[PDB]
Write a protein that binds this DNA or RNA. Structure first.
Ligand SMILES: Nc1ccn([C@H]2CC[C@@H](COP(=O)(O)OP(=O)(O)OP(=O)(O)O)O2)c(=O)n1
Ligand SMILES: [Mg+2]
Ligand SMILES: [Mg+2]
Length: 539
DNA sequence: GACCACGGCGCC
DNA sequence: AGGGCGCCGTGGTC
C-alpha cells in the first residue's frame, strides 16, 4: 500500500515528523514527511520543507505548528488523531498508546509517522461516526483550540529573570538559618530533604507520635499535614515547615525558570497538553505555569516575576466560583441557582464561618482557604479530615458537611444519578458530552469503588468547566488577534492575556464578555478581571 | 547521564 | 471515606 514519492506532497496530506526533543519551542526538526493516498513523501531538507505545508495534520499537529511559528511560518494545526482518540476515551493520552490501540506502532521515522497518522485518523474518524456530540466537541472545540494553543506556546510569557536571580541568593540564606536551626534542634545534621532521614529523627530520635503512614510503602509520614498536627509538640516542627516552603519554592520556581528563558524570545514557553487529563482539562508541561505560587508571601513574590512586555499589560480573567456554578446548572438545584441569582459568594460565606467573622471582614487569602473546604466537602471529604483540617471537633465537622448538602438538596440527587448512569453506561460525561470511563464504579472492593465514585461525579463538574473555558478560548482568540492583543496562559478557569497599554481596557472588557457569555447556563458566569504590569498585580 | 518509584507539594 | 495535574529530591536502578 505504501509507495515513496518525491517530497512535494498533495494538499491535505498527513504530516509525520521527528524532533530532537519533546519541547517544540526548543527542539530541532530532524525529519519531516507526509502521507497521502498510498504514497509517502520524505522531505530531504525538513526545515525548508516546512515552507511547503499549508497546514499540519497528523499526530501532535499543534507541536510541529509551534515549531513553525517559532520559525516564522504560520503553519496552523488541523486534524490530529490524538484529539479524536482523546475524545473517545480521555485515557488516550500518548501517540504510543493511541497507535497500539488503533492500528500501528509509534516509531522514530517521520515517514512511518506520516503513514501512521493517515491510517490512525481513518480508523478513529470511523469510530466517531454517530457520536454527534464528540464530533461537535472535536470540530467546534478541540481542533480549533489546538490552533489557539500553538500561538500561545509560541508567544510565551515575559519573566523578570534578574529579579528571580537575586531572590534566590536571598532565600538561599533564609534556608540556611532554618536548616542550621533544625539541625541544632535535632542535635546533629542530616539530609533535611530526605523524608526517610527526617522520619527517623522526628519519630525515632525525638519522641514525636507518628500520626500517619505513607501509601505504597507504609513509612511513617512526615507530611505538612502531619507536621501541622505536631507543630505544638516540638520546636523543630515549625522550622521544618518553613524550610519545606522555601526549598519547594526555590527549587521548583525560583531556580529553574530563569534557566528556561528562550534565547530568541527572552520569554518562557510552556507546553499546553491537549490530551493529558481524564476530565478534559488541559495541562502545562516543561515549564508548568499552571501552578505558579500565589498563597504565601514568597509565593507572591515569585508570581510578580511574570510580567508584560514593556508598553503592554497583563490582563488576567478568572471565572468566579466556576465549579459551584457549573454544579447548579448540572444539578438544577434551585437553592444553589438562587445563590448565584442573588450574587452570593459561597467561598466568602464559608470563610466567614471558618474564621468566625462577618463577611465584610473576610480577606482574599481567607476566602481562598475556604475553596479547599467547599470543594473538598462537595467532592467527598470526610468529617475526620475536615475537623482535622479546620481544627474543630469531629462532630462540628460532621455538622458542616450535613448542613452543606441539606442547603443544596438536588446536589446529592444529581451525584446519585450520575453514579447510577455511570454504572450502567460505563462512563460519565460532561454537559457537552465529554466522556470519562469509570469501570471501577462496579468494583466489589468498597475502597476502590467509592474512590472511583468520587472521580466519577467530579468529572462532569470539572469537565464542563473545562469545556466552557476551551470554548471561550476558541471564541476569544480571533478577536484578540484582531485587536493586536495576545493570549499567553490558561490556568484551568483563568486566562492570562497581554495587550498593548493603549488597548488593555478594551481587551479586558471584551474577553470578560466573551468568557461570561460563552455558553449561557441556568446561572450567570461571572468573571473577575485584573490589569497590571505583572501577574500578581493583574489579579 | 537517563530514568524510575515514592513521598511530598505547588496550583486549579 | 475531596477531584485534576506536573515537578522536585531521595534512593536505587541501568
Ligand atoms: N481546591 C480546588 C481549587 C479549584 N478546583 C477547581 C474548581 C474551581 C476551578 C478553578 O479554581 P479557582 O479559580 O481557584 O476557583 P473558583 O472556585 O473558580 O473561584 P474564584 O475564581 O472565585 O476565586 O478549579 C478544585 O477542584 N479544587
Ligand atoms: Mg475561578
Ligand atoms: Mg483560577
Amino acid at each position: 500500500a505504501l509507495e515513496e514519492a518525491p517530497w512535494p506532497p498533495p494538499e491535505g496530506a498527513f504530516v509525520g515528523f521527528v524532533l530532537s526533543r519533546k519541547e517544540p519551542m526548543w527542539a530541532d526538526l530532524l525529519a519531516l514527511a507526509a502521507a497521502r493516498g498510498g504514497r509517502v513523501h520524505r522531505a530531504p531538507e525538513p526545515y525548508k520543507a516546512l515552507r511547503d505545508l499549508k497546514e499540519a495534520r497528523g499526530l501532535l499537529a499543534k507541536d510541529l505548528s509551534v515549531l513553525a511559528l517559532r520559525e516564522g511560518l504560520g503553519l496552523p494545526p488541523g486534524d490530529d488523531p490524538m484529539l479524536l482518540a482523546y475524545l473517545l476515551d480521555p485515557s488516550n493520552t500518548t501517540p504510543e498508546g493511541v497507535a497500539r490501540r488503533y492500528g500501528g506502532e509509534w516509531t522514530e521515522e517521520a515517514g512511518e509517522r506520516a503513514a501512521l497518522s493517515e491510517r490512525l485518523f481513518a480508523n478513529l474518524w470511523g469510530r466517531l461516526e454517530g457520536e454527534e456530540r464528540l464530533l461537535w466537541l472535536y470540530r467546534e472545540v478541540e481542533r480549533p483550540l489546538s490552533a489557539v494553543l500553538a500561538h500561545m506556546e509560541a508567544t510565551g510569557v515575559r519573566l523578570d529573570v534578574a529579579y528571580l536571580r537575586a531572590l534566590s541568593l536571598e532565600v538561599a540564606e533564609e534556608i540556611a538559618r532554618l536548616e542550621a536551626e533544625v539541625f541544632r534542634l535535632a542535635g546533629h545534621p542530616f539530609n533535611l530533604n530526605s523524608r526517610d532521614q527526617l522520619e527517623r529523627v522526628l519519630f525515632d530520635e525525638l519522641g514525636l507520635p507518628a500520626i500517619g503512614k505513607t501509601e505504597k510503602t507504609g513509612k511513617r509520614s512526615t507530611s505538612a499535614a502531619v507536621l501541622e498536627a505536631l507543630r505544638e509538640a516540638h520546636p523543630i516542627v515549625e522550622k521544618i515547615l518553613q524550610y519545606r516552603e522555601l526549598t519547594k519554592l526555590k527549587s521548583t520556581y525560583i531556580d529553574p525558570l530563569p534557566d528556561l528563558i528562550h534565547p530568541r524570545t527572552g520569554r518562557l514557553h510552556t507546553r499546553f497538553n491537549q490530551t493529558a487529563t481524564a476530565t478534559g482539562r488541559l495541562s502545562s508541561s516543561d515549564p508548568n505555569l499552571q501552578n505558579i505560587p500565589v498563597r504565601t508571601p514568597l509565593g507572591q513574590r515569585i508570581r510578580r516575576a511574570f510580567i508584560a512586555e514593556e508598553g503592554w499589560l497583563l490582563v488576567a480573567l478568572d471565572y468566579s466560583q466556576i465549579e459551584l456554578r457549573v454544579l447548579a446548572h448540572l444539578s438544577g438545584d434551585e437553592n444553589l441557582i438562587r445563590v448565584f441569582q442573588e450574587g452570593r459568594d459561597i467561598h466568602t460565606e464559608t470563610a466567614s464561618w471558618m474564621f468566625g467573622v462577618p463577611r465584610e471582614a473576610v480577606d482574599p487569602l481567607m476566602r481562598r482557604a475556604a475553596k479547599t473546604i467547599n470543594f473538598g466537602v462537595l467532592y467527598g471529604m470526610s468529617a475526620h479530615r475536615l475537623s482535622q483540617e479546620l481544627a474543630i471537633p469531629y462532630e462540628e465537622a460532621q455538622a458542616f458537611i450535613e448542613r452543606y448538602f441539606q442547603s443544596f438538596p438536588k446536589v446529592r440527587a444529581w451525584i446519585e444519578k450520575t453514579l447510577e448512569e455511570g454504572r450502567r453506561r460505563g462512563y460519565v460525561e460532561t454537559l457537552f458530552g465529554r466522556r470519562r470511563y469509570v469501570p471501577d464504579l462496579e468494583a466489589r472492593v468498597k475502597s476502590v469503588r467509592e474512590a472511583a465514585e468520587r472521580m466519577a461525579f467530579n468529572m462532569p463538574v470539572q469537565g464542563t468547566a473545562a469545556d466552557l473555558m476551551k470554548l471561550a478560548m476558541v471564541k476569544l482568540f480571533p478577536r484578540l488577534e484582531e485587536m493586536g492583543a495576545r493570549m499567553l496562559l490558561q490556568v484551568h478557569d483563568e486566562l492570562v492575556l497581554e495587550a498593548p497599554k493603549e488597548r488593555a481596557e478594551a481587551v479586558a472588557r471584551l474577553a470578560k464578555e466573551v468568557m461570561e457569555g460563552v455558553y449561557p447556563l441556568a446561572v450567570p458566569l461571572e468573571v473577575e478581571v485584573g490589569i497590571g504590569e505583572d501577574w500578581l498585580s493583574a489579579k
